[PDB]
Amino acid sequence: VNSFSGYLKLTDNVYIKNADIVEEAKKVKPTVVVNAANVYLKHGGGVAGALNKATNNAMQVESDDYIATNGPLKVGGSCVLSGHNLAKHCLHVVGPNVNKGEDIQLLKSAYENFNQHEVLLAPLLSAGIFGADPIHSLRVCVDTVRTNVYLAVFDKNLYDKLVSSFL
């Protein structure tokens, strides 16, 4: 039993809700919140910009030190950093950005990072401003993630479309 509330159950291990991931993280304080990151951990917009704003830019400060030490992430890769005031940990995961021409096959690799954590609050990778089809992102999620994932979909209209088209 966990503290996530109001989710629709899609499969044995995937759950979905029309919610703002920032407000959802502040309420639940999950062990892991997933950020829709880029390789430079520049949290400028989309989910990343919103999560970082909620941390009063502390996420960005921590991320800049991480990059200065370690260099950029790989597309499809991840790193674990602090969750600040939102979660115990933030798993920064880099899905491919279609508006940068990156290989969508990397989406499966990106979701594989979720399997290193028993329970996660997450957005749909490569969705929104990353340019991929969110219905496809949800399919890859269900077919790749085996741990318990709670997906927050900001847009109510998108949320309803994802539920109604789900196979």
Ligand X SMILES: O=C(N[C@@H](c1ccccc1)[C@@H](O)C(=O)O)c1ncnc2[nH]ccc12
Chain contacts with ligand X (rule: CB under 6 A): 20-22, 36, 46-47, 50, 123, 127-129, 134, 154-155, 158
Q: Per residue, what are the HEC states of the chain?
A: CCCCCCCEECCCCEEEEECCHHHHHHHHCCCEEEEECCCCCCCCCHHHHHHHHHCCCHHHHHHHHHHHHHCCCCCCCEEEEECCCCCCEEEEECCCCHHHCCCCCHHHHHHHHHHHCCEEEECCCCCHHHCCCHHHHHHHHHHHCCCEEEEEECCHHHHHHHHHCCC
Q: By Cβ distance, which residue is nearest to ligand X?
A: 128
Q: Rounded to the nearest whole angstrom, what is the least distance from the CB of residue 125 to ligand X in the complex? A: 7
Which residue's CB is nearer to ligand X, number 47 or number 87?
Answer: 47
User: Which residue, 39 or 129, is less far from ligand X as judged by CB?
Assistant: 129
CB of 54 to ligand X, least distance (A): 9
Shortest Cβ distance from residue 69 to ligand X (Å)?
A: 25
Nearer residue to ligand X within complex by CB, 63 or 69? 63
